[PDB]
Design a protein around this nucleic acid. Sequence first.
DNA 1: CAGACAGCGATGCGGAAGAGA
DNA 2: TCTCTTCCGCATCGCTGTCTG
Lengths: 605, 390, 263, 15
Amino acid sequence: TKVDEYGAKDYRLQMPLKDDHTSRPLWVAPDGHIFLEAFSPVYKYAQDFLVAIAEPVCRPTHVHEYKLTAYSLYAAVSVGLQTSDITEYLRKLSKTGVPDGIMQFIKLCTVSYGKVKLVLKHNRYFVESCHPDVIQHLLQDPVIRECRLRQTVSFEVKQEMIEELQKRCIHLEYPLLAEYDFRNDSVNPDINIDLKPTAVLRPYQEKSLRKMFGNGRARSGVIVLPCGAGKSLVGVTAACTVRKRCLVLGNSAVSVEQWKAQFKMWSTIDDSQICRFTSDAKDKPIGCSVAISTYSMLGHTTKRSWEAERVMEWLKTQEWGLMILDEVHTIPAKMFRRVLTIVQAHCKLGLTATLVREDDKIVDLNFLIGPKLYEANWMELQNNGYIAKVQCAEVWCPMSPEFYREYVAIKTKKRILLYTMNPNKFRACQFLIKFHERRNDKIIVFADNVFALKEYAIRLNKPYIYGPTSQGERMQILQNFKHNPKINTIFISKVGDTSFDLPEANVLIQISSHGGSRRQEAQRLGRVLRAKKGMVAEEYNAFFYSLVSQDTQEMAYSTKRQRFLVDQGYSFKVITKLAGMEEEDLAFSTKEEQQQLLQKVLAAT
Amino acid sequence: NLQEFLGGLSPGVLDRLYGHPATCLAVFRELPSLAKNWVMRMLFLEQPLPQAAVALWVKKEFSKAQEESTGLLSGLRIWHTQLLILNPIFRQNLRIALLGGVPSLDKYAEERWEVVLHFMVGSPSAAVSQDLAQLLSQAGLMKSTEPGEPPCITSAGFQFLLLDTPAQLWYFMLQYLQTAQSRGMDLVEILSFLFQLSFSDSLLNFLQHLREFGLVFQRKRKSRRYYPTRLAINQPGFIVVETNYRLYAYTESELQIALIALFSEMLYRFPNMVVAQVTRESVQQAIASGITAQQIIHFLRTRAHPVMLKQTPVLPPTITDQIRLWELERDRLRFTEGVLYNQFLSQVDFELLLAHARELGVLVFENSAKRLMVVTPAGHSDVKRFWKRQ
Amino acid sequence: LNLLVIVVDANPIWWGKQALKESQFTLSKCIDAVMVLGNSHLFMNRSNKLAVIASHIQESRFLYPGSKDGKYELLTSANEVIVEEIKDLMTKSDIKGQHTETLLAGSLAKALCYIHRMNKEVKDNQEMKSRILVIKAAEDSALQYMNFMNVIFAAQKQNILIDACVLDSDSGLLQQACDITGGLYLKVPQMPSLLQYLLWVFLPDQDQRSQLILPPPVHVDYRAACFCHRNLIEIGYVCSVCLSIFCNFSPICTTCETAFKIS
Amino acid sequence: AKERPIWLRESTVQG
DNA sequence: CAGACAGCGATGCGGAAGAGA
DNA sequence: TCTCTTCCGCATCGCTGTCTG
Ligand SMILES: [Zn+2]
Ligand SMILES: [Zn+2]
């Protein structure tokens, strides 16, 4: 609240300093931001404690950055951490005390939890609460009565209005409890699903699962994990532990296919007990319990097919023990978020790898599903070898003179097709691919602009893939890339970042970018994170290039596009010039060649 | 360096400067490797010796060390060819110099210097001294232009600010000596005192200024005896740098925070720590004032917390690379005053003028293909005079 | 830095003979020359430090662990401490006719450990290149060969240069000592002009000794002799126990008493 | 073998 | 600035035409 | 004759862009 002569807020008169400050490696700002030391001998103990109560926002190598909020604190109580259980240790760990504002905030957040509990039974949602006083003063707003369908006091609530009420209670200072007591539940018989000994659970995976299962009752929340970290395995394990009906929801045809393979590979459950509620193909969804479906079909808004209609009615009627939603970052979408209310589930676990977006709808994920249970440390995984180390880089490609003139001259937005297609980046990518091609490194180019992607591919006569590409040709190209030594590069369009199972690649060039989308960058980055059989963290075998054009709008997006990655700890190095580019022969080595491309670019319209 | 200072002096002042007590000794330590040895050898000799002997007294290998040493001392004029006997005054004085004839202080020096820097920056609370302010103003690192308003800080002031204390102080005293002559203070008398430290009206005023900079402290109500501080004769780092342009400095002295704020945005200030971010806005702001990326990297490097000393390089490459790039963008458009030519009837005259400009150095850039060149306004008169002369 | 140690051989039997002879050179001047060399040495750099050791038939005592004339304070302490200490040692001394040869091996022995003591305390940041400027002034003793050889080897392993400066006599042992450790060996024949030598030959340190012209080393006669006679012998018959050079084949070497088996 | 490229090993910025 | 509509590039779904037993 | 497989036609989302207030 107090501002120094500079921008920083003043806290000299706010909180004191512990005499043994050096022993205590923890800081506590009044705003809730916390700065831990990654060099302290007791760093690990602090890391576990802070992660339990706070959600990371920046975890560079030396000094991590944690901020706590109401959602973060509620999760701590769910795992059994009381206000004194956390504040006492926080004061002990704090090297500068705890400001009263945080103290009262912690007290208010912890006490305002568990008073209101939401339980669904017999397809009816009852807002149970041991304390009756909470309900008495909770019915002041008229929305509650109209929302409601027309000790331990409970009342049934309308199915459709659950989401509206859930967000209302969050700002009402009375969060709802979504814990599932699968251990004590006889209404829905347990499913015959078991985890085979073959599956191996990594220490972070166990910790993420442990945080989800704070007590005998499973907690509904979001577990963010890298795609190469094996987030699919964790989802399977959670379903196996619940031992009740689970409805995994994908986002595309590829997503549903992989999940079924993951279930069979890691779960002993029989093949016949798994169904694919997919329009393209089905396996008698009503017949068995464990099902894999997609947001589009379940949330499909237009006319429903007769066969789908029966399945949809069957899904609505039944009650699901678990509702795994992979790629939760798309949930707050209008159609996608409707699926939450359409189906009934006790705890709706959420998995993903890039929990970031521009529109401030990510915060809704806290109430749409639950608090962010776990968010693995990408840097720590790199040290442990679970994830391939990446030498993130940003190759600056100076714009050719003529190209800039039209780019600056025109105030229209043809520039997206212009600065994405310039000779220097073309030579840069052409040179960059050539260097990696002779190094036996697998390349995965990317480009939002299909027009640029096709032009780059034909000139480099490489197997470019994109949306309307035939499925058969899509598989044929991938198989050659994985197997054929003669080919070690595939030019994938945006479809690559959506969902796929691609072979591990040593490098990932990105000539163009869709825009300032932290999702796409992290989505595309996860492709090379696939750990190799016998690599090492320090070898930096995996690389990532995000080619950009200097003095162009592309730079603004690139800096705005790397915010999420740097927060994890990745350092994006800049490369003004590439050694050996001049000696190596490359296309567009003469003014005429650039002129024809510019004319074609201008003729694009 | 001190060698540069003594090098630019006349023979007349040099021997006078070679006072008996110390100067013959202080200038001796300066002698890097070999001149020391040669000085002692010809210290008891009253007979000059031929120049050939000195040349052949160093083996063929490392012969360069001989030439640089002889050239260095010839400027110092310790000997004369006399045809290489040493100066009798220096010989006598040196022979007289060779068998012939605390914890609180450093804190005071640390504190006194710190307050001076506080005044140097726009610190509302600082020590007031009219003599000190004007001295810095005429030192070339400050300009007021308005006695009523406190003086501001020039471009050179910021560069001086980010320098390390030894280089910062040494340069500061260097200007004092140059300005001492301008104000009329004898250079020799004041200079000799500095050497005597490492072992009149002007002296009292000179000592008063030294006492003001924190180098000395009488401690006895300005008595004749003085106890020089450590800085008179001539530490762990604290800043922690992340990979996301975030600085965590364990600074309690407001000076360090003020220095960091010059090229970064401050976010939080804890009792024993402060959080700052190195964003484009701050760095270019510092570059605009006059700083260059080298000082910031050096300043961050020198004040490097021990935690990041283990990693090599100490400063992460991205932070260093980003800082260098930000300054480069500022000077993408290099402005240089000049005068253009047009309508060259013949290239021979243009070539002849080009040769004339090259000889005089007036030319700044030339274009043979377009038959044109650019000349600075200073050389514009010279070429214009040449054109008139035909 | 460099830690110089000057081992002055002040033998009253020999030096006093000069006083009786009333020669131009005297011990007082010798001390002054060494005093100057020490002062000049420390003159070279602040980090440089020195010491001094005196030799007597009985023992060796260290001569070294304001500006009244306008002098440098530190060197003034050196001037006073040595002058006071040297006179005390010379003025007070017992008489023992049996033992009159100058003692040098023990004098060096104190130095070698002294450098080691300094070498331990000094900060590891700065490297110390020690040296010993032995200044002999009298003939050596035969009985001291064994002890003197050991200290010389100790210097070699410990990397200390023994810069001998014998005068008025060429002690074959000392010149043998300096050669092992690579120290220079200068035999000044003009005692009055001794000091000009030190500031030119000895004073320059090992760092600059190589890149400098100095008098060539003297040939060393690594003679060997049987214990029968002490005469030069080119073929020696040593045993596996005594390791003693002997004259001719014998049934059993006396110093061994071993049961040698013929063959 | 399998050594990192020059433009990644060291800064390519002209400084 | 700001709210509504729309473009380019991706996805899903549901209604109608070729080989093959 | 089914049957599968495959191909148009709707609808949706990410992110940005345009347009008049
Ligand atoms: Zn014999
Ligand atoms: Zn024997």
